[PDB]
Design a protein around this ligand. Sequence first.
Ligand SMILES: *[C@@H]1O[C@H](CO)[C@@H](O[C@H]2O[C@H](CO)[C@@H](O[C@@H]3O[C@H](CO[C@@H]4O[C@H](CO[C@@H]5O[C@H](CO)[C@@H](O)[C@H](O)[C@@H]5O)[C@@H](O)[C@H](O)[C@@H]4O)[C@@H](O)[C@H](O)[C@@H]3O)[C@H](O)[C@H]2NC(C)=O)[C@H](O)[C@H]1NC(C)=O
Ligand SMILES: *[C@@H]1O[C@H](CO)[C@@H](O[C@H]2O[C@H](CO)[C@@H](O[C@@H]3O[C@H](CO[C@H]4O[C@H](CO[C@@H]5O[C@H](CO)[C@@H](O)[C@H](O)[C@@H]5O)[C@@H](O)[C@H](O)[C@@H]4O)[C@@H](O)[C@H](O)[C@@H]3O)[C@H](O)[C@H]2NC(C)=O)[C@H](O)[C@H]1NC(C)=O
Ligand SMILES: *[C@@H]1O[C@H](CO)[C@@H](O[C@@H]2O[C@H](CO)[C@@H](O[C@@H]3O[C@H](CO[C@@H]4O[C@H](CO)[C@@H](O)[C@H](O)[C@@H]4O)[C@@H](O)[C@H](O)[C@@H]3O)[C@H](O)[C@H]2NC(C)=O)[C@H](O)[C@H]1NC(C)=O
Ligand SMILES: *[C@@H]1O[C@H](CO)[C@@H](O[C@@H]2O[C@H](CO)[C@@H](O[C@H]3O[C@H](CO[C@@H]4O[C@H](CO)[C@@H](O)[C@H](O)[C@@H]4O)[C@@H](O)[C@H](O)[C@@H]3O)[C@H](O)[C@H]2NC(C)=O)[C@H](O)[C@H]1NC(C)=O
Ligand code: MNH
Ligand code: MNH
Ligand SMILES: *[C@@H]1O[C@H](CO)[C@@H](O[C@H]2O[C@H](CO)[C@@H](O)[C@H](O)[C@H]2NC(C)=O)[C@H](O)[C@H]1NC(C)=O
Ligand SMILES: *[C@@H]1O[C@H](CO)[C@@H](O[C@H]2O[C@H](CO)[C@@H](O)[C@H](O)[C@H]2NC(C)=O)[C@H](O)[C@H]1NC(C)=O
Ligand SMILES: CCCCCCCCO[C@@H]1O[C@H](CO)[C@@H](O)[C@H](O)[C@H]1O
Ligand SMILES: CCCCCCCCO[C@@H]1O[C@H](CO)[C@@H](O)[C@H](O)[C@H]1O
Ligand SMILES: CCCCCCCCO[C@@H]1O[C@H](CO)[C@@H](O)[C@H](O)[C@H]1O
Ligand SMILES: CCCCCCCCO[C@@H]1O[C@H](CO)[C@@H](O)[C@H](O)[C@H]1O
Ligand SMILES: CCCCCCCCO[C@@H]1O[C@H](CO)[C@@H](O)[C@H](O)[C@H]1O
Ligand SMILES: CCCCCCCCO[C@@H]1O[C@H](CO)[C@@H](O)[C@H](O)[C@H]1O
Ligand SMILES: CCCCCCCCO[C@@H]1O[C@H](CO)[C@@H](O)[C@H](O)[C@H]1O
Ligand SMILES: C[C@H](C(=O)O)c1ccc(-c2ccccc2)c(F)c1
Ligand SMILES: C[C@H](C(=O)O)c1ccc(-c2ccccc2)c(F)c1
Lengths: 553, 553
Amino acid sequence: PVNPCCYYPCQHQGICVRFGLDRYQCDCTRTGYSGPNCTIPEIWTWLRTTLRPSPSFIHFLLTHGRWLWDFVNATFIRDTLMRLVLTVRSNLIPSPPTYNIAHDYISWESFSNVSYYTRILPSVPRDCPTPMGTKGKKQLPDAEFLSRRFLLRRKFIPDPQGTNLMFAFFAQHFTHQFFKTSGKMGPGFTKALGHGVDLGHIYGDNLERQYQLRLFKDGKLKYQMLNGEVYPPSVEEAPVLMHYPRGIPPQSQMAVGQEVFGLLPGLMLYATIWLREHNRVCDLLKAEHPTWGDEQLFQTARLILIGETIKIVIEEYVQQLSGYFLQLKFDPELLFGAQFQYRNRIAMEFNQLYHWHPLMPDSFRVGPQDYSYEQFLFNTSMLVDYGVEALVDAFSRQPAGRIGGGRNIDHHILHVAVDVIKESRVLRLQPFNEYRKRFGMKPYTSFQELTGEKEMAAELEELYGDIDALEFYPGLLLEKCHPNSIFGESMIEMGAPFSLKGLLGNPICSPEYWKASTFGGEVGFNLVKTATLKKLVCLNTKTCPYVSFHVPD
Amino acid sequence: PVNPCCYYPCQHQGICVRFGLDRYQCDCTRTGYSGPNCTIPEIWTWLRTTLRPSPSFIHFLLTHGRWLWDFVNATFIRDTLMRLVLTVRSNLIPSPPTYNIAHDYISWESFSNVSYYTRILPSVPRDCPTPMGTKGKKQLPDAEFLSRRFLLRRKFIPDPQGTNLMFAFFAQHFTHQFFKTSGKMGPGFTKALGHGVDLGHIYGDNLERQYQLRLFKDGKLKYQMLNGEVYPPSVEEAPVLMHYPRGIPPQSQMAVGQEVFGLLPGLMLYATIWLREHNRVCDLLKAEHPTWGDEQLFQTARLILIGETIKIVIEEYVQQLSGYFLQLKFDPELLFGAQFQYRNRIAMEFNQLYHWHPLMPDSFRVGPQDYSYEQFLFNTSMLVDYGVEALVDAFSRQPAGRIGGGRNIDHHILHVAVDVIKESRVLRLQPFNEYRKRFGMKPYTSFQELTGEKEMAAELEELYGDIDALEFYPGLLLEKCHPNSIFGESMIEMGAPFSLKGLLGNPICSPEYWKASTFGGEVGFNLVKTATLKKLVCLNTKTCPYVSFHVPD
Ligand SMILES: *[C@@H]1O[C@H](CO)[C@@H](O[C@H]2O[C@H](CO)[C@@H](O[C@@H]3O[C@H](CO[C@@H]4O[C@H](CO[C@@H]5O[C@H](CO)[C@@H](O)[C@H](O)[C@@H]5O)[C@@H](O)[C@H](O)[C@@H]4O)[C@@H](O)[C@H](O)[C@@H]3O)[C@H](O)[C@H]2NC(C)=O)[C@H](O)[C@H]1NC(C)=O
Ligand SMILES: *[C@@H]1O[C@H](CO)[C@@H](O[C@H]2O[C@H](CO)[C@@H](O[C@@H]3O[C@H](CO[C@H]4O[C@H](CO[C@@H]5O[C@H](CO)[C@@H](O)[C@H](O)[C@@H]5O)[C@@H](O)[C@H](O)[C@@H]4O)[C@@H](O)[C@H](O)[C@@H]3O)[C@H](O)[C@H]2NC(C)=O)[C@H](O)[C@H]1NC(C)=O
Ligand SMILES: *[C@@H]1O[C@H](CO)[C@@H](O[C@@H]2O[C@H](CO)[C@@H](O[C@@H]3O[C@H](CO[C@@H]4O[C@H](CO)[C@@H](O)[C@H](O)[C@@H]4O)[C@@H](O)[C@H](O)[C@@H]3O)[C@H](O)[C@H]2NC(C)=O)[C@H](O)[C@H]1NC(C)=O
Ligand SMILES: *[C@@H]1O[C@H](CO)[C@@H](O[C@@H]2O[C@H](CO)[C@@H](O[C@H]3O[C@H](CO[C@@H]4O[C@H](CO)[C@@H](O)[C@H](O)[C@@H]4O)[C@@H](O)[C@H](O)[C@@H]3O)[C@H](O)[C@H]2NC(C)=O)[C@H](O)[C@H]1NC(C)=O
Ligand code: MNH
Ligand code: MNH
Ligand SMILES: *[C@@H]1O[C@H](CO)[C@@H](O[C@H]2O[C@H](CO)[C@@H](O)[C@H](O)[C@H]2NC(C)=O)[C@H](O)[C@H]1NC(C)=O
Ligand SMILES: *[C@@H]1O[C@H](CO)[C@@H](O[C@H]2O[C@H](CO)[C@@H](O)[C@H](O)[C@H]2NC(C)=O)[C@H](O)[C@H]1NC(C)=O
Ligand SMILES: CCCCCCCCO[C@@H]1O[C@H](CO)[C@@H](O)[C@H](O)[C@H]1O
Ligand SMILES: CCCCCCCCO[C@@H]1O[C@H](CO)[C@@H](O)[C@H](O)[C@H]1O
Ligand SMILES: CCCCCCCCO[C@@H]1O[C@H](CO)[C@@H](O)[C@H](O)[C@H]1O
Ligand SMILES: CCCCCCCCO[C@@H]1O[C@H](CO)[C@@H](O)[C@H](O)[C@H]1O
Ligand SMILES: CCCCCCCCO[C@@H]1O[C@H](CO)[C@@H](O)[C@H](O)[C@H]1O
Ligand SMILES: CCCCCCCCO[C@@H]1O[C@H](CO)[C@@H](O)[C@H](O)[C@H]1O
Ligand SMILES: CCCCCCCCO[C@@H]1O[C@H](CO)[C@@H](O)[C@H](O)[C@H]1O
Ligand SMILES: C[C@H](C(=O)O)c1ccc(-c2ccccc2)c(F)c1
Ligand SMILES: C[C@H](C(=O)O)c1ccc(-c2ccccc2)c(F)c1
């Protein structure tokens, strides 16, 4: 008796449940559809899907007609559209969360145990005929071969949207606060229990670590002075676990919230900027509240930095990534009149989707000097040698690589993609086409439709045998990009829901928290409301360099 | 300089914040008022409070005109009113939670660390002139004296609403799943991390314990047979820590989710009933899903019992307690059109308010036998000696004591009340009158108004010196009771918000979870929708005894 749920019979978010020895039933509750397979639409459902323009057409609208968008951005329409974007995208993410690596069904354990990443679609049942369900071959393509053939960079392909390394390192720094897969527990488990923008990559993911990083004076974080500049303290002064190669003296190791940030100067650079910002805010708070103790100063500054982070991510980071002419806006009040849960649980699919390694260049240019990967990775003196401004200027000027399209991952880090594919099979992620449907898109009917070309498509078809066997991550990276864009429609249609839900799902965005008193008053509240990448850097450096998520002109 | 917030200047939920060396500012955001102290109403705010009838009047309407209610209860008006009750009561509880014993302000730590109970009103600042703020004497009345004088029972006072011991033990059993103050960490901390109806008192508050309790076959819980009846297993078979007097061997201990249930036959009675219900549901589930494994059977049965619990608590437990002619209803769908957060955090005030020791009798009667506290407490054989049916019958027949009114706590357990008062001072809970205002009532202007009499009021005035110095717990237990009611209005006006938010705030009540598939299909969903105290007992016992939360007529 072949498990009927292996055919993914239930459509439009209907839930497949096994009944008896060989039957199945689809729970169509609130899907907007009825029938054995949740395929019979109600009137409003049918109209909505019949009138909704394609993701590609909407993408076109949002990236053309600057004159019209400028006009619209200056009106209430900006708010109307931002609210629509927030609600429509977020609603595709279940909240409270549903499944995890252990339970392909709702359970109290999945709801309460936050050491688990959640998941949007249940796993491919273990008893299915093929690894992907019922389609494809008995054995999936070799992960290594797949990576060498379709993901390995031949010649660097710059991002057409002008994205730079300042952006690339921000993305890596930012995402590493909520993606922290546990080596000890295995795939499907995380150590970032905050499951969102808690800034645990600055303050630590646990209390004792936070306490080791804190000065416990004026609400500040410990630090050290080098060349008259402020930097994170060494592991000697802040006895915290850091992942550095054996053989590196403790005095040369910097201690920050995230244990892996010693890996790249680009990561430690952001750790330095944010640490400086935290202490700068502590100073502003104390001037306003001389009676406050160290604890309240520390806690309030953290809330302010969380807000500054979400503000910058929405209005500058996502703005650069989307390429939209619509001026995005971070305003929690846009959701006060809607039904929305202020909670977030990080999905394993979101983790996979965010492996944007193609962004990394062939080498790292700092002024007239060109640094190789061996001169960059784990280099513990470069940040201090050049200082914050110099590195920000260089990273802001160097272009990052295009993410989608294929063949654009530097050989130095290709092994990461190989492991992502291997872990996807351990997590038993459903095929790319099933995720397409889950996020409102039609499944691809062939590999040529996916790639937009013929040679790679033919080889993929040979390897996978069926488009319905194509895996999640490979599909995301091999999909044809939007015209002159950094990646394809799926990265946007699937990634936007996860990202936006994770930003606005934060408790500081709730009516209960979003008030001036939460941030120590008007001064703190305005810091959040007017935060900018430029101010983040320049209010914390001697001089102000070129700073942006876009390469200069 | 005297801390200005010691005067509780900000009204209507405005937040008091210290500015400069001696100033304060009230954050009136979304309170519906403006002005230095949030006292100037907006037009709609003024209308709402002017047309709003008093709690006493509303109570009258709900306990009179049975003929009218009988009509209402059979129409959709029942739903309209239940939704109104749910939303208006729940809106008084902040969500996400705000403060805790360490932070009298919003912070990421308060939001994320669930080992802390939350609190609704901040503590009395440690630097205030008097223990309660600015009113009263420099020293509060001795806790032991206060208890002896006003809380000690002199003559048993039965509850005029007919509440029985079956109800009392349900209340004790039920609340002990979310009130588990940590002896190690101290006041302000809890071990019940589920913060609500997770049934941790049946399955254990931690995974390791749950695993020792589970059979790992058919999704069931371990059990043992005695006199042909099913009971919880022994600690020898289920190696779990249970709090029993030293000298009682593991083979003679019963292992259940909550460590302290061996203390009373009444507690183990419910532990036994729910254990039998769990395994019963597993049988029903397996019949429907023969392909399911032990894990899914166990998790699904747990979800069903959670739903059954909420159903019985709202429609029978709270119904009995309220004495309303309005037929309360548990229907999550009532809130699907409203803005509501599906989460809960247990408040320290809710813990205090739920110390209903007056309910306990002078002795426990089982048929012709009358057992004393010395014979009842920690009795290791009574449950098995009599069996479930006999104890349910006896407890359903014996009257429980009136909660409010004062002087009704049996001397055997008066020490608990003494400790509650002492814990209250450690927690630095604000005065009863501040809580009255926080929950929408006018503060009492004198002790005579509070008690409704002259004798106790006169002595209370002498001891406290000022009505605004009266503490939270004593205030709840000494306030005059509603006509022929089990307690006063404050217990209802303050208790209803916490209780209802805790019941509906459960994730199973969310649109995401409230579906047939969550409970294994229609059979499981109906078990929840039709749950009853009588069925809970009789579908798990040989014979059907008198079972109710009210003594027989
Ligand atoms: C979140 O969710 C994750 C995933 O579930 C949790 O992972 C960890 O917790 C699990 C439970 O502790 C770990 O499971 C392992 O199970 C092994 C097998 O043990 C079996 O259970 C008992 C063992 O007890 C037996 O009897 C006596 C009684 O006193 C006992 O002393 C003795 O040890 C004896 O074995 C028994 O019925 C069986 O025969 C088995 O022994 C354990 O050996 C192992 O130590 C562990 O407990 C799981 O491995 C943990 N780690 C991971 C990554 O899975 C995580 O804890 C959850 N987080 C939270 C906060 O809840
Ligand atoms: C939820 O919230 C509660 C309440 O905060 C929290 O409670 C528990 O956690 C804290 C922090 O771990 C415990 O702290 C206690 O106090 C001291 C900490 O003082 C330190 O001071 C010195 C600094 O240490 C230096 O750093 C070196 C690093 O290598 C170290 O080796 C040396 O010690 C060195 O001196 C030091 O002198 C001292 O030893 C301490 O490190 C602890 O020692 C003490 O044992 C306590 O842990 C709280 O007590 C603890 N429990 C309570 C009830 O407060 C929970 O953990 C939070 N829960 C979660 C999930 O976050
Ligand atoms: C835990 O609970 C169990 C019950 O489940 C306790 O055991 C029971 O104890 C009672 C009294 O201690 C035993 O009483 C039985 O019936 C009569 C009762 O007394 C009669 O009524 C009054 C009281 O004196 C008098 O007017 C009458 O003349 C008459 O004495 C008693 O006399 C019998 O001898 C008989 O024991 C009951 O039998 C017993 N049940 C069992 C199965 O043991 C147990 O003690 C308790 N543990 C603790 C620590 O107290
Ligand atoms: C960690 O990062 C540090 C950067 O802060 C590294 O250091 C710097 O390393 C560079 C490269 O080795 C070093 O370069 C000096 O010498 C260069 C001479 O080479 C010239 O440029 C071209 C390269 O061959 C030729 O075309 C040209 O003819 C000439 O030969 C010169 O270009 C540089 O400007 C510079 O003078 C820097 O001096 C180092 N700076 C410091 C502060 O020491 C360090 O090596 C990294 N650590 C590790 C282990 O890799
Ligand atoms: C020089 C650049 C660079 C290097 C050496 C690099 C290295 C790694 C290594 C090593 C791993 C872990 C792999 C394993 O197999 O266990 C990993 C994981 C990961 N990395 Mn990348 N990474 C980037 C850039 C780099 N990453 C950029 C740019 C981003 C974009 C946001 C990114 C995002 C991720 C994500 C997301 C993970 C997964 C983290 C987790 O699950 O713990 N990264
Ligand atoms: C026979 C009767 C009986 C006994 C011996 C009993 C005893 C105790 C003891 C001892 C403590 C812990 C006190 C301390 O000072 O630390 C405690 C706590 C508590 N009890 Mn009563 N208790 C009841 C009945 C009893 N309780 C009933 C009935 C209820 C009503 C719902 C109730 C509710 C509470 C609550 C609530 C707590 C606090 C739990 C927590 O903070 O851990 N109960
Ligand atoms: C609903 O989904 C099932 C499962 O894929 C579809 O397939 C079933 O019905 C077909 C129609 O006769 C049979 O030919 C298939 O063998 C059978 N497969 C299984 C797994 O039972 C079914 O057609 C779908 N029905 C609708 C109305 O869409
Ligand atoms: C706001 O609340 C405060 C505190 O209850 C009120 O009290 C302050 O002002 C009074 C007016 O003269 C003084 O008599 C009090 O001593 C003073 N107390 C403090 C906190 O310093 C104040 O009157 C209220 N103001 C308004 C506009 O209602
Ligand atoms: C109501 C007015 C409609 C005008 C039709 C606009 C046509 C836009 O056409 C768009 O062109 C893009 C490429 O440039 C494609 O990628 C989109 O899928 C396609 O819809
Ligand atoms: C209310 C929001 C409306 C957004 C619609 C903006 C879409 C911009 O549409 C633009 O209109 C121009 C007309 O001169 C065309 O020339 C451009 O090709 C087209 O992209
Ligand atoms: C013309 C400008 C319109 C701006 C509104 C865009 C926001 C709607 O975004 C929509 O969200 C859906 C669910 O996530 C997706 O399935 C659609 O493809 C996407 O276009
Ligand atoms: C038509 C609407 C008329 C509204 C009349 C406003 C009445 C509320 O009046 C307010 O009462 C408070 C407490 O007594 C005072 O502290 C405020 O200063 C006062 O403005
Ligand atoms: C009885 C008349 C009641 C009128 C209700 C007042 C509505 C709120 O009116 C507001 O008052 C503010 C203070 O000047 C202005 O700044 C706002 O623009 C205005 O909308
Ligand atoms: C829609 C909800 C309506 C609630 C109103 C219920 C109030 C019951 O009101 C009752 O009406 C009786 C009339 O015969 C009087 O005799 C009772 O004294 C009075 O309490
Ligand atoms: C006549 C029937 C009326 C049913 C509506 C009752 C529900 C409203 O309940 C109200 O909740 C408020 C907030 O907790 C309290 O302050 C009010 O005193 C209370 O009556
Ligand atoms: C605003 C816009 C949209 O909703 O279309 C949009 C586009 C892309 C993202 C996005 C952000 C991070 C990873 C992947 C996708 C996003 F979060 C929002
Ligand atoms: C339905 C009614 C109301 O809201 O008035 C009501 C009355 C009393 C309670 C209540 C339940 C447990 C402890 C304290 C109060 C409750 F939860 C609900």
